[PDB]
Every structure is written in C-alpha cells, then in structure tokens.
Amino acid sequence: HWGYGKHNGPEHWHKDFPIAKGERQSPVDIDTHTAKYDPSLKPLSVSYDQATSLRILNNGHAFNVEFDDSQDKAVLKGGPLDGTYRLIQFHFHWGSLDGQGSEHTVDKKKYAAELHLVHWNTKYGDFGKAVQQPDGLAVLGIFLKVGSAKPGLQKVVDVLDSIKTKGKSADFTNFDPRGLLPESLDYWTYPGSLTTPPLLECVTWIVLKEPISVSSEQVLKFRKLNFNGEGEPEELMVDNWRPAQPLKNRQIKASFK
Ligand SMILES: NS(=O)(=O)c1ccc(CCN(Cc2cccc(NCC(=O)O)c2)S(=O)(=O)c2ccccc2)cc1
Ligand SMILES: NS(=O)(=O)c1ccc(CCN(Cc2cccc(NCC(=O)O)c2)S(=O)(=O)c2ccccc2)cc1
Numbered sequence: 151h152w153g154y155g156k157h158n159g160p161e162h163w164h165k166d167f168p169i170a171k172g173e174r175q176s177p178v179d180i181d182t183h184t185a186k187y188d189p190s191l192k193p194l195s196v197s198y199d200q201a202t203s204l205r206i207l208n209n210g211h212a213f214n215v216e217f218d219d220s221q222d223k224a225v226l227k228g229g230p231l232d233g234t235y236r237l238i239q240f241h242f243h244w245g246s247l248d249g250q251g252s253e254h255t256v257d258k259k260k261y262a263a264e265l266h267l268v269h270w271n272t273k274y275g276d277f278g279k280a281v282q283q284p285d286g287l288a289v290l291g292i293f294l295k296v297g298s299a300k301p302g303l304q305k306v307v308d309v310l311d312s313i314k315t316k317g318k319s320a321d322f323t324n325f326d327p328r329g330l331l332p333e334s335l336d337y338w339t340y341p342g343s344l345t346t347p348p349l350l351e352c353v354t355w356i357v358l359k360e361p362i363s364v365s366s367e368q369v370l371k372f373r374k375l376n377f378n379g380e381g382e383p384e385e386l387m388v389d390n391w392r393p394a395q396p397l398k399n400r401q402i403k404a405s406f407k
C-alpha cells in the first residue's frame with residue numbers, strides 16, 4: 151500500500167495511480183511574482199457558524215476531523231467557486247523538522263505544516279460522486295509556522311494521545327474550525343488534484359496567503375502520532391507531505407493586489 155516511506159512514497163505512487171503524472175496535479179509551488187491578481191474573483195465566504203464536528207480518526211496517513219455534511223451547516227462559497235461546497239473533514243500534513251511539512255510552497259519556501267479543509271460541491275449529491283468531477287471539491291489550504299500557540303488548535307493536540315495509532319478514532323464533537331483560520335482571507339487559487347492517492351483531478355485549490363502560528367509544543371504532539379497500528383513497531387507519523395508537482399498549462403490567480 152502507498153505511503154510516505156522510501157519504499158512506498160510519492161516517487162512510487164504513479165505505478166498504481168498513473169494520474170500521478172497528469173496535467174493538473176497538486177501540490178504546486180506558488181511563484182508570487184507570476185500569480186496574477188484577478189479583479190473578477192468574488193470575496194470568499196467561509197460560513198462555519200453551524201459546523202457539527204463528529205469524530206477524529208488516525209487513518210494511517212494523517213488524522214481527519216470529520217463533520218456532519220448531511221445538510222448545509224459548514225459551507226464554502228464565493229471566491230473562484232460556483233455553488234455551495236460542504237465541509238466534510240479537515241486534516242494536516244507536517245514535517246519531521248520545522249523547515250519542511252507543507253505541500254504547497256511559496257517562492258519555494260516550505261512551511262512547518264499545512265491544514266486542508268475539504269469541501270464537496272453539493273450539486274453532485276455525495277463526496278464519492280463529487281471526486282469524479284473536475285469541479286467536485288474545494289480545498290482550503292492554510293500554512294502553519296512555528297511561533298506562538300494557536301489556542302483553537304489545542305483541543306485537537308490534546309486528543310491525539312487517544313488516537314496514536316492507525317485505525318483509532320475518538321468522539322470529537324463541538325469543535326469550531328473557525329479557530330484555525332488566520333485574520334485575512336486573501337488567497338491564491340488554481341485547478342488541481344487530491345495530494346494523496348487516488349490523486350483525482352477534482353479540486354479547486356484555495357490557498358490562504360497568511361499563515362497561522364502554532365507552538366513548537368503543538369507541532370511536537372503531531373510528530374508523536376504513529377503511521378503503524380497498535381502493537382506494531384513504532385513509525386512516527388512525520389513527513390506525510392507530497393512535494394510540489396509540475397504546474398504544466400495552469401495559471402495561479404491571486405485574490406489580492
Ligand atoms: N504505487 S504505491 O505507492 O501504491 C505502492 C504499492 C505497493 C508497494 C509495495 C510495498 N512493499 C515494499 C515493503 C516495504 C516494507 C516492508 C515490506 N515487507 C514487510 C511486510 O509488510 O510483510 C515490504 S511490500 O509489498 O513489501 C508490501 C505490500 C503491502 C504490505 C506490506 C508490504 C509500493 C508502492
Ligand atoms: N490532501 S487533500 O486535501 O488533497 C485530500 C486527499 C485525500 C482526501 C481523502 C478523501 N477521502 C477518501 C476518499 C478518496 C477518494 C474517493 C473517495 N470516495 C468515497 C468513498 O470511497 O467512499 C474517498 S476521506 O477519507 O475524506 C472520506 C472517507 C469516507 C467517506 C468520504 C470521504 C481528501 C483530501
């Protein structure tokens with residue numbers, strides 16, 4: 151099975167998932183001097199006041215915080231998007247060291263981690279149908295740097311001991327994802343893909359310019375998670391990021407001057 155080791159990492163994925171070498175793969179490097187301001191982009195609407203978190207799961211690659219997406223409770227609209235995109239889950243990608251971990255890069259800069267808030271287009275009815283469409287998903291990406299603690303992340307950090315290994319889950323109700331956002335919603339956007347197998351080319355990427363700050367203690371607790379299952383030799387869950395892919399025939403647009 152695929153992963154992030156020497157033997158099953160990103161450079162191997164194309165053998166089982168040939169779209170790995172496709173025309174709209176993610177992540178990418180964001181060249182800030184080449185991205186063009188697009189005055190036609192609408193303001194982005196993040197409407198998370200009625201968000202209903204349910205559970206947190208260690209899936210052997212990352213951890214997902216899952217939401218009730220059976221109604222329009224936590225939605226993303228506007229920006230580059232046509233229609234309404236429901237929040238289904240968030241997760242992170244992070245490094246073994248503070249100088250790596252993000253998937254997207256900014257002028258080749260790597261951040262310590264990257265948060266992905268995953269949303270699906272309601273016109274396709276369910277997530278599994280949406281990932282088969284070029285406009286099926288919208289992923290809101292937010293960079294993490296190490297500095298001051300993020301208060302809104304601590305509830306996540308403190309439950310990680312209870313889901314140390316692959317397959318473990320825990321109740322995770324009443325978590326407000328607004329506490330993970332930066333002040334500004336300025337963004338870059340481009341058409342891309344899932345960053346893990348099956349690497350489907352279904353994603354409108356919206357990457358925020360402003361990173362959030364988390365503490366060294368917070369990211370240290372991410373790095374104590376395990377890729378392995380219970381009772382197996384320990385392999386720390388670190389470096390679960392895909393490197394930048396070729397941009398090919400794509401333009402990155404900026405929401406801001
Ligand atoms: N294209 S991709 O990224 O989806 C992809 C698919 C399959 C593989 C192959 C993974 N193995 C290399 C390996 C690495 C480490 C240990 C072991 N053996 C110990 C064990 O597990 O009993 C084998 S393995 O076939 O030997 C193997 C398969 C399944 C489970 C365990 C092992 C790579 C990459
Ligand atoms: N890094 S990223 O932001 O680009 C990104 C990468 C991967 C994914 C993973 C999406 N899920 C798994 C999955 C992948 C592909 C297709 C399907 N079809 C539905 C199915 O198989 O039941 C599910 S899921 O784990 O969130 C899920 C589980 C159960 C039900 C629905 C969704 C999200 C986002």
Ligand SMILES: [Zn+2]
Pocket residue numbers: 241242243266345
């Ligand atoms: Zn992701």
